[model samples]
Target: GSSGSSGLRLGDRVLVGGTKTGVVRYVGETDFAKGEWCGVELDEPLGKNDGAVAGTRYFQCPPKFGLFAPIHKVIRIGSGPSSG
Candidate 1:
């Protein structure tokens, strides 16, 4: 069943929040927020979680690197293949 949450996946790179760039780790629903959320491993300690919402572990990175921002606030740029 291709109901599909496959629009995004664990991939190479991304520039989340515009002010920071990171290696995106996950993309899907989260308990911390409503609706689709985007998770990325940031450059420094500028994020809210360590790839986890609370007691859970989403990935193994610095707590600052784990940024689970709402996907609405995320727009995948700079990585597209010669779209520009």
Candidate 2:
């Protein structure tokens, strides 16, 4: 993906809590969608290392507050820099 005046693009360096994670993929519609939602597939997965569910999973916001924004501002797992 490529960054436009609207927002960041795929492969763009997003700083998350002092750690640098690669933007693995881009999720959104090509035409109907307004902005591209970044799908930052982590280098490793959390919880039990089952291997099947390990590595490169989606980072999403809490389900309860998902109605506030346009699936963008509601939960920010990767966007700007921060202290871990």
Candidate 3:
């Protein structure tokens, strides 16, 4: 689990549950749920809905490949190489 400031942001690559890899697509509050949620596009098809919660689209992905989780559920896997 993640703690303290995660410094997470959009387009960040992260490890989910220590087993799955994904990229952060949406971060912050959503109309589908309360509080902050991280929308991730998993590398594998081991997720829930396709970034759509209750018919609201936050991001697009294949079925069971998009997931929304709390910040504490995801671990940052670095931000990848910068384009500078």
Candidate 4:
């Protein structure tokens, strides 16, 4: 079974909004937005922006492949293969 509340850290594979999966890139406060935000490089090109919000760059990725969200909105996914 997979716990949806796994802790997040750099390089941790996570699922955002229970639909999009990506690798954690940055975790902390950003000048682009108030409060802590998580920067993730999505596995697909289904992201809103390229890790840049409000003209500030926190992390780099292809256009429309990077995203930032509040820490509570992210769910950490397992790094191991699922047990059949």
Candidate 5:
């Protein structure tokens, strides 16, 4: 149930359905960085307080939003319209 915006950027806050949270940070691939992923800086570091968040891509998005929703909702799926 990905919100379809799982790889885009957030200005500051994000709201999916009833859930709400801040835009920790974006994890995208750059000349230095690689792959498609976003490292979300939760309001409070999940740490052990709310259990682990790695390897758990499904539960990243706000609950009730969608199943397997990443921390950051992708504004558009894939690399937008194909260039080819």
Candidate 6:
């Protein structure tokens, strides 16, 4: 968990919405969507985009592994982001 108290950073582990846990791969804006978007590599194939939105690539991951979430929806599930 790293950010502006949202404190998210590259290679950070977090709990994305839909109760999914993943690591933060890209933390910035997207060419296709508004608001600050963060690319996450989900622990499972529970995602829609492979770090690409509207034909723009943000991060690299297998298909259905990469997903974007609005920064405000992020949760700082500290200490390895494990749901333990």
TM-score of each: 0.73, 0.30, 0.77, 0.76, 0.31, 0.81
Q: Give me the runs in candidate 5 sitting further than 4 Å from their true place.
A: 1-6, 14-20, 30-34, 48-84
Model 4 RMSD in angstroms: 4.3
Give the candidate order by descending TM-score.
Answer: 6, 3, 4, 1, 5, 2
lDDT by residue for model 3 (1-84), tens: 365447478888888788789999888888855778898888888998898888888777789888888876889867455565
The C-alpha RMSD in Å for every predicted model, in order, reads 3.9, 10.7, 4.5, 4.3, 11.0, 4.3
Q: Which stretches of candidate 6 lie over 4 Å from their true place?
A: 1-3, 79-84
Candidate 2 off by > 4 Å: 1-5, 16-20, 30-36, 47-84
Order the numbered candidates by lDDT, best leading: 6, 3, 4, 1, 5, 2
lDDT of 1: 0.71
The CA lDDT of each predicted structure is 0.71, 0.35, 0.80, 0.80, 0.38, 0.82
Query: C-alpha displacement of 4 in model 4, angstroms?
Result: 13
Question: lDDT (0-100) at residue 49 of candidate 6?
Answer: 87
Top candidate by TM-score: 6
Pairs of colliding residues, candidate 5: 5-73, 5-74, 5-75, 6-73, 6-74, 7-74, 27-38, 58-68
Task: Give the Cα-based TM-score of candidate 4 against the true structure.
Answer: 0.76
Worst 10 residues of 5 by lDDT: 44-53
**C-alpha lDDT (0 to 100) for residue 40 of candidate 3:** 82
Candidate 6 local distance difference test against the native: 0.82
Q: Please list all clashing residue pairs in model 1, or write none if there are none.
A: none
List candidate 1 segments past 4 Å from native: 1-6, 79-84
The per-residue C-alpha lDDT of model 2 at residue 34 equals 68
Cα-based RMSD of candidate 3: 4.5
lDDT of 6 at 14: 84
lDDT over C-alpha atoms for residue 78 of model 5 = 34
